[PDB]
Amino acid sequence: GSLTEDGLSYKEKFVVRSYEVGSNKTATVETIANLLQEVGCNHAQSVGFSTDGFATTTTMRKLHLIWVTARMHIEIYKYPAWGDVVEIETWCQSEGRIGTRRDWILKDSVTGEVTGRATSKWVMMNQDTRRLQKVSDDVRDEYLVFCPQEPRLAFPEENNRSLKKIPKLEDPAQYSMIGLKPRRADLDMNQHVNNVTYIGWVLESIPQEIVDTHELQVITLDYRRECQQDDVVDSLTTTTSNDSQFLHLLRLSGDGQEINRGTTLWRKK
């Protein structure tokens, strides 16, 4: 991997592994999400930011401040097959008062065609209190020199899917998968549940018949609260719709405290 010529974005190539593919012999959306996270981590390492997933500065670290994902939106046109080389380009931009954004473009290395795209919205928060806080000018100034300042969007369209408001699923859910718990492989280096695990938990309540006869085209996920190492989660799904659409909700098994909500769009094979 390497920063591009203008130093305002980062590119990396990946060969799809045997354990990274699903029933179609192509990479799963969780393998894609792991790769987006990996290239974001390598971009941070390339310019001196933390490499723990929070991409902090020394100033943020002494104030116990971190960057946290508020929303992840992924759209895949073609899932790469086992042994294929996928090239991923990533960049970040400030959105002032709303927070910050990281975008990605996935391409087939052989043809150069865009096979997928993703965007994520981030907010600054105190690590201990979990209270959101506005980024100071002195912290912001350290990041702007690594971002393009002219808008560069992976999703430029007028009222695109990445910005749509997601409603809360109402009981009873059409489908459910209960008692989901994270194991040590689901945790990052700081013992937090990896964002990719929540994607897997959302998809667990999709009926296998849909998975067998459709391909996942779009996934949007809002992150409201962290699932702790010892928490148990319920995954709820209701069909909202050639295409199938679902509304999703992840909540704690006991009190029903919401941790995530999202929507998925599937296309018939």
Ligand X SMILES: CC(=O)N1CCN(c2ccc(Cl)cc2)CC1
Active-site positions read: 190, 192, 227
Residue 17 lies near its own copies (rule: CB under 8 A): yes
Q: Residue 53 or 99: which CB sits closer to its own copies? A: 53
Closer CB to its own copies, residue 22 or residue 63?
22
55 binds its own copies (CB under 8 A): no
Among 143, 198, 246, 266, binds ligand X (CB under 6 A): 143
Piece in contact with its own copies (CB under 8 A), picked from 117-125, 161-169, 180-188, 248-256 = 180-188
CB contact at 8 A, 6 and 89: no
Q: Using CB under 8 A, which of 46, 114, 160, 204 touches its own copies?
A: 204
Residue selected from 9, 10, 28, 234 as contacting its own copies according to rule CB under 8 A: 28
Please report whether residue 40 would count as binding ligand X according to CB under 6 A: yes
Residue 189 touches its own copies, criterion: CB under 8 A: yes
Residues that bind its own copies (CB under 8 A): 17-19, 21-23, 25, 28, 30, 34, 37-38, 41-42, 45, 51, 53, 82-83, 179-181, 183-185, 187-191, 194, 196, 200-201, 203-204, 211
